[PDB]
Amino acid sequence: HMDINNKARIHWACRRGMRELDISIMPFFEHEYDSLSDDEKRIFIRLLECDDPDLFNWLMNHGKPADAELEMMVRLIQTRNRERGPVAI
Amino acid sequence: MDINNKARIHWACRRGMRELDISIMPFFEHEYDSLSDDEKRIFIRLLECDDPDLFNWLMNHGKPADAELEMMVRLIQTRNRERGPVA
């Protein structure tokens, strides 16, 4: 597993194949990663090892991961992104 | 307004953006009858929003300024997450 303290390397791992994933994951990393506990950081890194179609399904709420830690992290990304992004009228 | 004409609500769930296909229509088909009248009215209001906003909101690229719309987006998310495949 990638070292939780090597932020620039984790940032690279956040760069994905798909537009919707890059809009979601990379800004979450840039604005939220420092707020995470070590356990949460380890989980985030594990989430990045998942395939893009699964990440997209999960971030889009087409079901969820069977792994509760991954589910928790997907939900955390969604929550933080919803609160940080544009408030649209 | 018209919360009873499910055929027309169904049609309004077919969006110009097909990115919205996995989310809105299946929510309607599986969850609409569970909604209160107030929730149904808010869902119909949400369907009048523009597709770029709906897609942003459903992917948590920010949220509606309107708290009713925010709640409804979040309910769609929750229900879709609970109903979809566990991978």
Domain CATH code at residue A37 = 1.10.150.250
The Cα B23–Cα A70 span in angstroms is: 21
* Pairwise CB contact (< 8 Å): B61 & A78: no
8 A C-beta contact, residue B62 and residue A87: yes
Resolution given for this structure, in angstroms? 1.2
The Cα A70–Cα A85 span in angstroms is: 22
Task: Report the candidate in B81, B83, B80, B42 with the shortest Cα–Cα distance to residue B64.
Answer: B42
Host domain of residue B15: 1-87
**Cα of B5 to nearest chain A Cα, Å:** 27
Task: Provide the CB-side half-sphere exposure for B75 (13 A, CA).
Answer: 19
Domain tally, chain B? 1
* Pairwise CB contact (< 8 Å): A88 & B53: yes
8 A C-beta contact, residue A88 and residue A39: no
Instruction: Report B:49-78 residues touching A (Cβ under 8 A).
Output: 53, 56-66, 74, 76-78
* Pairwise CB contact (< 8 Å): A85 & B23: no
**Cα of B76 to nearest chain A Cα, Å:** 9
Determination technique used: X-ray
